[PDB]
């Protein structure tokens, strides 16, 4: 029974090793909006007689 206690304690230490890590790479990334219409700024001004 004492040996079973000792062996189990050593096994727990051996299981404390770390396998790897995982993370998400997202810094520097932004979302894009979509502009539907082209912003023209032209207006036509004409005289009443059409001259």
């Amino acid at each position: 029974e004492d040996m079973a206690k000792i062996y189990g304690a050593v096994a727990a230490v051996s299981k404390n090793v770390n396998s790897s890590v995982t993370y998400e790479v997202k810094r520097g990334t932004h979302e894009l909006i979509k502009v539907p219409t082209i912003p023209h700024n032209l207006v036509l001004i004409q005289s009443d007689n059409g001259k």
């Binding site: 090793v17 770390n18 396998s19 890590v21 995982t22 998400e24 990334t29």
Partner: peptide, 14 residues
Amino acid sequence: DGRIAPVKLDLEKQ
């Protein structure tokens, strides 16, 4: 695998 499962870290927060 008797090793610890991969640790998930919250990184690269915008």
